Write a protein that binds this ligand. Sequence first.
Ligand code: CHL
Ligand code: LUT
Lengths: 216, 81, 222, 41, 234, 207
Amino acid sequence: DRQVWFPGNAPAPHLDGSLPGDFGFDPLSLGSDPQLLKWFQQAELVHGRTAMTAVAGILFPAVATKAGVVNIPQWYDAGSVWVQNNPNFPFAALLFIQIILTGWVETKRWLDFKNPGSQADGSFLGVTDDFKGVANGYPGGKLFDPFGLSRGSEGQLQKYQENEIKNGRLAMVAFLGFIAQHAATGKGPIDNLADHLANPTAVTFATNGVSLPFVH
Amino acid sequence: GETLIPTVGFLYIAGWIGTAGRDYLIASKGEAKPREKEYIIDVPLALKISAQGAGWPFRVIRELQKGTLLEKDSNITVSPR
Amino acid sequence: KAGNWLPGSKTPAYLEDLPGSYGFDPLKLGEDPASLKWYVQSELVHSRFAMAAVAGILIPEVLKAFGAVNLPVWYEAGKYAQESSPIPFNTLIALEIFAFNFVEIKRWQDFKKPGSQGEEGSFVGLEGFFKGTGENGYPGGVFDPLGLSKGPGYEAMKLREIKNGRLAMLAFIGFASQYLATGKGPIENLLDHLSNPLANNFTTNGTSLPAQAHPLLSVLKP
Amino acid sequence: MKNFTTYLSTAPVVALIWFTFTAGLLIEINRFFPDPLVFSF
Amino acid sequence: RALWLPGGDAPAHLDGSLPGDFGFDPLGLGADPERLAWFAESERVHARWAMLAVAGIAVQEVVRPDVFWYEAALKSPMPFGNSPAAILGLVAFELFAMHFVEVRRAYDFKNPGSQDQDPIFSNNKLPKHEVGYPGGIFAPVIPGDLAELKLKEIKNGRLAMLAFAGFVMQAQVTGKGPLASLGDHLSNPIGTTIFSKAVVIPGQAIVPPCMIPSSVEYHGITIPTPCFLSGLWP
Amino acid sequence: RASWLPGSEIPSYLKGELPGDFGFDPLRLGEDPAALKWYQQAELQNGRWAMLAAAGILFVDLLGHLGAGGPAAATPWFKASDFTYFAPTSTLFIVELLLFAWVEVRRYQDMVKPGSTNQDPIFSQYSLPSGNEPGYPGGIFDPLGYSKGNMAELKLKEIKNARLAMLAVLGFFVQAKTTGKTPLDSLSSHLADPWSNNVFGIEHARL
Ligand code: CHL
Ligand SMILES: CC1=C[C@H](O)CC(C)(C)[C@H]1/C=C/C(C)=C/C=C/C(C)=C/C=C\C=C(C)\C=C/C=C(C)\C=C\C1=C(C)C[C@H](O)CC1(C)C
């Protein structure tokens, strides 16, 4: 069959290769229920797209900061810097605005999950065709896909779906690495990369100080 | 604020809990295996019924006025006197 | 149905033909038909009371903001009226109790038996005032002297009354909570929000978000 | 996964989750609002 | 047909009907046909605006070598009004005129042949044409056949779009006009390219600073003038 | 078919039946036929009162500027209530309210039932002609023979001038609120230097 995460091991029997990024990886069998599988597919897609946006918004400002062009604060300090530099914008007001806007869009996504195509009735400002949804976790339409990269050809859509899911998984692992590297070095990720590129034989996890708590 | 407002708060929460339990029992009575839902909880149904217990006094007072809150004495078993 | 309060949700079937219905009953309070009739009447009475109250607060407040008149604000208007009132407090309360006992018993009796207050002998000769329209919460008679319920736009006016009523109810509760949290008038609150909407809202009044419940308020500050 | 969620729906597991939530809510209320004796603020 | 990459295969949604169709769509942006028509109109208007802009930049750098085209708005003439706030009137006039003409063009696109009549004089009427190619009074003379001229137009427009991107980026990295940068490249070909003053290796990175100031004070407005993604420069 | 936006879709309930029908209803405000009839009557009433208001504001403005009027025309239209007349402000409002009550109750009785109020109440021989539109009366309201000779064309001119007058009166109201100047002063300031004295710049200077 297809390529699997553990060569020589059969894929999970509830994973038949229809979903993008299906490598048969479910050792805990969390996706046995098809409805729970659709829910977890939406979870993986939302997590991966959020991670991709977050990793880009961490990396490109940090790359620009490393070159000396700008002085954008590191990702672990940007909330503090924003609060100290914006006394007229309280934290609670910003949190309330974020919560109501995200609640609107996520409740629309949730109600589409419960009943697909139900947001297509024109109740939101007359939007009908763009809120119908192409597949589970893939809305599409003229609003979410304005360049029409999903409406061209089927094979192009499957290729882009594979690209999206694999880059999303890579970005999720990258954000986990960001957390672990900040907790171990106290520096940004591009700072860590520059330190590794400067002298890679001595700049390792074994020399940060916390991954190996002993002296050695 | 020492006893009276705590009395109102407790009575509201206690009626909430009792009405949620009654609604769950009545809903489970209509199933094919009514005893099954009493020890294997229908968690989505219990969460939906539990959230609906906020409006318990309106529904309970209506059932009291309608006569549907109480079982008739002819339908309840008793011991010989 | 005027619409759906939650697009995509399954609206209850008993709210299909009501005026001002968006299918909103997540607590299933109106599932019983008798409860639904009683709550339709209750929503209409609350709506009209809030409508008149919000008018009597906002229109004097807007005229004061424009400088047309100088009337006392709504949270203190009881004090200045009672000092210049020829009728003192206790007899005003007693008269209000008597009058509202009479008129609300008449309204209640019409709710229980529709058209009963318009039959012969229901009043002392003046029962034609209250013949009723045969509809729950829409009395007519003296209460519709211009007779615009017989017009073509009766159903649109029912929808207009209910939606403005819900807006007025939320507006009066907003007035009360805004006074209890900020201590100022409603137009003052509106002008403070318009001057600096990021910093002047409920998140900075010191009441709506208690400090003990939200420890991050004192931490994430300049 | 269906059988595992059915086991989590059994009465002692549901009781454990519910009483953990209720006890935690009471504990965190008494932590955030220490010594509540009367309804006064 | 002529392909952007000879020996390659054109995508199936580019048959060759459009002018300048060389089978270049590796991302599949035009695979939707209505999106292809909209993007064809967008490419035409972008090409014509870039052609006019490149010609104007070249002419007004030849005519006035003392005025930077990037900074030309700060030293622009004011033939209308005796106040520094007269720019807002010119902005309003331009917004009205462009709203009218672009609504006319857009409604020609959505409804072909609807905007062919003069709204003032009902005798004047544009003849029937294709979408995006009005003709009539807009084209009093056509020196040659239409298809070859369309190919010439789209080729010159793509060259002008690339040229305007080059003009902008060279203005950021050199702080000077196009032909002055061309003369500096002709003086020292080996030491004036982008490969000369910009090198990134894993060890270190050398990034040329941008000579355009980050902001300017235009009658108390403080217009921001950010260098375009200067943190991502090589 | 003439329209406000050529090449765009027209609502199905606007088919040229109404005078001045250019299909302009982006909000779909008049959908039920009864609401559309009320809005036609309201457009006619607001437009005619706006035509009268535009004439009355423009006549005073040139009289005050040229001095051809008196001290009354010297005051602005928004300050004309501070002028002293023979009667105080309270009584004039009451008598005009009574006269308007009579006139508009007659008009509304025609609106509810066409042809109901067509006879002189005190003269049984003086009656309006039959076939009267709710918004288009006859008889003494048209003392000259003007309703022959393209009635359809004259309705279009009426509604056009009515819309222009409504926009002009709204411009009077808004320009008095922002600039605090009479309409002729605003026209002269625009004709002084239009590229800096317009809605842009002035409102940017106001801020
Ligand atoms: C809607 C009713 C209502 C509300 C919300 C208020 C609210 C207020 N009044 Mg006010 N009043 C109200 C009705 C009346 N008041 C007054 C006479 C005064 C005076 C003289 C003064 C106030 C002042 C005040 C303010 C001081 C706070 C207070 O006294 O809380 C009262 C809060 C209440 C909720 C009052 C209870 C109203 C009640 C619910 C009405 C309905 C009761 C019926 C028996 C309904 C029973 C159920 C039915 C179905 C049988 C506050 C803004 C004073 C203030 O500014 O000084 C500090 C002030 O000096 N009021 C009269 C005259 C009889 C009322 C008539 O109903
Ligand atoms: C079970 C359940 C079921 C469902 O679920 C629902 C629910 C609700 C939850 C429930 C039901 C029920 C029943 C019906 C009950 C009723 C009863 C009786 C009959 C009463 C009497 C009888 C009663 C009476 C005697 C009573 C009482 C009286 C007394 C004097 C009191 C007093 C007071 C109070 C005020 C409070 C404060 O603080 C204090 C005091 C001082 C203490």
